[PDB]
Amino acid sequence: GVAQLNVALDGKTLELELDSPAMNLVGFEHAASTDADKAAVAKARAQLEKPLELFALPVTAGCSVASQELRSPLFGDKADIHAHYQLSCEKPELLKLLTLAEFFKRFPATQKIQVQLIGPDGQKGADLAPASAELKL
């Protein structure tokens, strides 16, 4: 139950890249057949489309979404989910702490998240888990 997250904080710009097996987010590795499959896909799509909620960005930072991409056949019009987010924060000084607590609540099949961070300070790695879901930005 292992996802990657790449974070990049340069000034106003916050970039988030999630790479996860479909299993963690949707509950299965096939394309969507049954009603129960189509409803799990739609629940995951709706959640991944609200990144300020899923990554619990603090409202005080003034974060807004400039772009977001879901790359998977599950989310196209016709075995890995990629989710790319470009955010812009009016007060990025207030981004002190990234919490994946909400990601773990909304996708409880995710047991561990490997985070890479890149910032004016350099590169930083951490393994996050429901137990310790926080990372100093």
Author numbering: 19 to 96, 121 to 179
Paper text:
The structural and zinc-binding properties of PA4063, one of the periplasmic proteins expressed by Pseudomonas aeruginosa under zinc-deficient conditions, are presented. PA4063 has a noncanonical ferredoxin-like fold. Two zinc-binding sites with micromolar affinity are exposed and are located on the same face of the structure. Two histidine-rich loops, which are disordered in the apoprotein, contribute to zinc coordination in one of the sites. These findings strongly suggest a role for PA4063 in zinc trafficking, possibly acting as a metal chaperone or as a regulator of a transport system.
PA4063 crystallized in two different forms corresponding to space groups P41212 and P65. The asymmetric unit of the hexagonal crystal comprises three protein molecules, but the interactions are so limited that they can be considered as simple packing contacts between monomers as in the case of the tetragonal crystal form. This observation is in line with size-exclusion chromatography, which shows that the protein is monomeric in solution regardless of the presence of zinc. Despite the differences in crystal packing with regard to both lattice and asymmetric unit composition, the conformation of the protein in the two crystal forms is almost identical (Cα r.m.s.d. in the range 0.49–0.74 Å).
